[PDB]
Amino acid sequence: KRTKFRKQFRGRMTGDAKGGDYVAFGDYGLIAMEPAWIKSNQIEACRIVMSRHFRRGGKIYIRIFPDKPVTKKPAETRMGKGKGAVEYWVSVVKPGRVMFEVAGVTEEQAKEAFRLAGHKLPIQTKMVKREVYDEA
Amino acid sequence: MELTAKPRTPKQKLDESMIAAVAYNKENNVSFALDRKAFDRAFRQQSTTGLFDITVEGGETFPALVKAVQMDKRKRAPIHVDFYMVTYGEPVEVSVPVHTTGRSQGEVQGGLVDIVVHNLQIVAPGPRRIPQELVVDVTKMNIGDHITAGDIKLPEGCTLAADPELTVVSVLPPR
Amino acid sequence: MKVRSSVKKMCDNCKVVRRHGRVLVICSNVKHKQRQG
Amino acid sequence: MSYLIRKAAGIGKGSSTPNKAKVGKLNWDQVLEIAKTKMPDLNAGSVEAAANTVAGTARSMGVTVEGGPNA
RNA sequence: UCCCAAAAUGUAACGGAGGCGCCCAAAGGUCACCUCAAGACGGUUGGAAAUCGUCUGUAGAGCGCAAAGGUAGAAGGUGG
RNA sequence: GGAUGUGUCGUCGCAUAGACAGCCAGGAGGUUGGCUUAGAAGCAGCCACCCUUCAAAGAGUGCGUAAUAGCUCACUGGUC
């Protein structure tokens, strides 16, 4: 969710994935296919939903942590400088990236644990399976 | 896998379903360019622990091994491949996947067993006889049973490159 | 009748029809009677 | 069956953790009298039919079953 | 002094961070010499670190203050 | 985001030794499976999901009650 301590601010830019593996920590995983900002509350909205579906196992890996502070409008003005260090924290995701990947539970019993998680995401994803063997 | 071409220029393939790999050892690192589909259907099985027929256009069957494959992001599709020609008595080192069999005594119990490390690497495989898999006992494993390299029975010869006390699978607790 | 934007099956009956330009849903059960338009 | 079984092991209820905490165990001998009553309800081909049929019943009530074959 | 500044320089904003208006008869000139942080094992008030000792040790320390570059064949640490 | 709207490439698949959809008939015995409950008997929720017969019929699809019950499915044969 929210980081523990840091610097305080940032900026904005994009270009395709870079460190989003594939299989690892599980057999089934969910992959993001579009450039976006993933709100930390948009992850909970995913995890939590996923939990419910899984009556146990917790074999859910969320490997897209919010390494980013965004700001906002103190109400209107414009005559002041940097604003709202605290609007919210997001975690820039890029295509091919892997935010989710369950483990242990049946295909179907997974093709749903994701589907749902998809429904609260600002981007389109697609489920991936195996044959992932680069580095280890 | 009848790969025929092998030039720096791939216009004649990029449009036409054809992957593009390279092979070697220390002698010949013949430029290459095999067929999409084929490799695609191929590597699935033999994976990286499977040497296959490489008769390049002209007919010169060669023995190699799937070393490293780098596929496209966004599109699960593969783009490049490295074939490290087989050997005879020694290749280098190989990547062999860990597998389970028989219900574990932790599953029905109250928790689920987890495989801390999917594919495992052992020192010195042994060209001609390199484990195209690795089934492992899990049953015994209860509520916190971690198995390691110092456990897994190896195929007469093969030595474990992975540090021993390293957990390959444990049976994770419930919830 | 149900005019939803995201129409889809609801039980082993829903016969998703496509009448005049519209995507419809006809199931033995009526509360299943769907329709995008 | 469940009733007679309870009585026999002495079991008390049933179980919801028949995988964690089960309840007990008995011998085939008992299983004899059982079939020798449930018979008019045991469409069994010959014994074993009902000799093993009853296993599962005892096998999902949390009842560990004695002996059987071999050794 | 950093970042923004788009690998020369330069480059704005009520853009993002932080210091100065000193200090040192020596914290200087020169000439000699020593070399750090830290962990581990073992040791007295000690017992967390700290003192002594023994291994490891690009220095992960130090440089009067803010940061950056720089620096141990010393700009680091003593004495004439 | 939704969809038997078309076009073209790929994957399983399952199959004249006669499938799919349709049709007549069947449908199991233990068991109201154990557990939990004011009770819940293939269908509110824990645990499993074995036995027997058979050509067959899975402790089980969904609908239904306060549970019943009742209605069909998966598995079975003929007719094409």
CATH of residue B173's domain is 2.170.120.20
Rounded Cα distance, C2 and C19, in Å: 16
| Count of domains observed in chain D | 1
How would DSSP label each residue in B142-153? -SS-EEETTTS-
Rounded Cα distance, A61 and B154, in Å: 31
- Tell me the residue range of the domain where B123 lies: 87-175
- Tell me the residue range of the domain where D11 lies: 1-71
Q: Cβ–Cβ contacts within 10 Å for residue D54, how many?
A: 21
The first and second tokens of residue B37, run together, are 């589909």
* Distance E37 C1' – B123 CA (angstroms): 38
Rounded Cα distance, A14 and A93, in Å: 9
- Give residues with Cβ within 8 angstroms of A74, minimum separation 6: A80, A83, A84
A112: alpha, beta or left? (left if phi > 0; alpha if psi -120 to 50): left
Cα separation values, B81 from A105, B74, B112, D13, D71, Å? 32, 18, 36, 63, 56
Q: Which nucleotide is nearest to C11 (CA to C1')?
A: F62
Residue B122 pairs in a beta bridge with B94
The residue of chain B nearest to residue A24, with distances taken between CA atoms, is B118
Does B111 share its domain with B79?
no
Cα separation values, B90 from B49, B53, B64, Å? 13, 19, 12
Q: What order do you get walking across the sheet with B21-24 strand by strand?
A: B21-24, B78-84, B66-71
Could you tell me the domains of chain A? Answer: 18-136 (3.90.1170.10)
Q: Which of B86, B112, B127 is the last residue of a domain?
A: B86
* Distance F77 C1' – A51 CA (angstroms): 47
Q: Å from B17 to nearest chain A CA?
A: 20
Q: What is the DSSP letter of B72?
A: P
Question: CA torsion, points D21, D27, D33, D37, in degrees to nearest 10?
Answer: 30
Does B132 share its domain with B104?
yes
Rounded Cα distance, B58 and D66, in Å: 70
Method used for this model?
Answer: X-ray
Resolution of this structure in Å: 2.9
